[PDB]
């Protein structure tokens, strides 16, 4: 480690790099020392250590901010059943309902991962990218943060024509043999589209239902819930609530992947 470090002379003081290394060493050993800080929210911890669908409660959802629906004046009355009441000039999403729908969604995510399906996480909002990529990594899955070019599934051959396809084991090993030009040009459709802002990409949803793909979406109090197969009522605007739901879904899919790998090994 640190092969190019030119250490200063013993008579001389520390160099800048040497000093930095010393600081790092101190940080690793004795900085986080005096106390330990239990019961506090670190944003990163929801992405890298999301809870299982089972262990989620209503309280956790409330803390995440999932309960906060759009607004009283921006109400799609189609979503009436999901909403608990109004408060602070804002519809508040029934969170027991949210929980049950999330569990249902989580189970279907797990199932397709187990079957070895292509899961696609779609999230066009600003802060969502990193968490989306993490989720995609967790299950051997896919994501979209930069905008969804209309017709990725309906007009697949024009759009997704010149990108490399692969082969895969019952495990996830590339088994790198040459794909034939006929073998390459076929569409590779997702087996689960999961969106974080269905109201912002109506188009993607429409192609999914045309292309015959089951889809999951965070339905806020202004979003149409009929436009998807498995709606999760919740707060799609705040970045952390979305991440929490997304991270849970990723964890559910991860589990199913692990189970598939285990059964392959067997």
């Amino acid at each position: 480690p640190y092969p190019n470090l030119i250490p200063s002379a013993n008579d001389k003081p520390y160099s800048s790099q040497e000093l930095f290394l010393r600081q790092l060493n101190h940080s690793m050993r004795t900085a986080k020392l005096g106390a330990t800080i239990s019961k506090v929210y670190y944003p990163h911890k929801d992405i890298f250590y999301p809870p299982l669908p089972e262990n989620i409660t209503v309280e956790s959802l409330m803390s995440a901010g999932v309960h906060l629906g759009q607004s009283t004046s921006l109400w799609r009355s189609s979503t009436q059943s999901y909403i608990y009441g109004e408060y602070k000039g804002i519809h508040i999403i029934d969170l027991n309902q949210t929980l049950s729908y999330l569990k249902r969604a989580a189970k279907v995510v797990e199932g397709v991962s187990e079957s070895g399906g292509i899961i696609l996480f779609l999230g066009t909002r600003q802060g969502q990218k990193r968490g989306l990529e993490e989720a995609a990594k967790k299950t051997h899955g896919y994501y979209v943060s930069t905008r969804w070019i209309p017709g990725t599934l309906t007009n697949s051959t024009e759009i997704s024509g010149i990108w490399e396809k692969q082969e895969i084991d019952s495990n996830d090993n590339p088994t790198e043999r040459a794909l034939s030009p006929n073998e390459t040009s076929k569409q590779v459709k997702p087996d689960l589209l999961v969106v974080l802002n269905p109201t912002e990409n109506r188009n993607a949803l429409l192609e999914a239902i045309k292309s015959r793909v089951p889809t999951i979406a965070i339905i806020d109090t202004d979003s149409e819930p009929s436009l998807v197969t498995y709606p999760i009522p919740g707060n799609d605007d705040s970045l952390r609530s979305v991440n929490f739901l997304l991270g849970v879904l990723a964890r559910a899919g991860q589990r199913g992947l692990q189970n598939r790998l285990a059964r392959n090994n067997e």
């Binding site: 930069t146 990108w163 396809k165 895969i168 084991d169 794909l179 590779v188």
Partner: protein
């Protein structure tokens, strides 16, 4: 067996570029604490490996930014992995006569 896309960004607009950016981003994240203290491939050169016709100026500028910052990591603290990742993106005198006069 299953036929499946290589890149996790496959479905995005410019998938190859996005994938390329992701590795650099990961590296930056890894060595984000390392203290900081030119000949990068052209747009056209980058396109041939990256997006091609789907490569945009903004994407290229982002890529440059990612590379430059990584490069700036104090040479003494830099890693082998970082340098390997960056490796990809690199790349007559007149005199007087016998009689001491300058022709032009």
């Amino acid at each position: 067996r299953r036929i499946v896309p290589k890149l996790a960004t496959f479905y995005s607009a410019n998938p190859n570029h996005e994938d390329r950016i992701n590795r650099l981003e990961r590296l930056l994240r890894k060595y984000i604490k390392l203290p900081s203290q030119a000949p990068w491939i052209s747009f056209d050169e980058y396109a041939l490996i990256g997006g091609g016709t789907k490569l945009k100026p903004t994407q290229y500028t982002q890529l440059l930014y990612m590379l430059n910052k990584l490069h700036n990591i104090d040479p003494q603290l830099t890693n082998d992995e970082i340098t390997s990742e960056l490796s990809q993106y690199y790349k007559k005198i007149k005199t007087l006569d016998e009689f001491g006069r300058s022709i032009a």
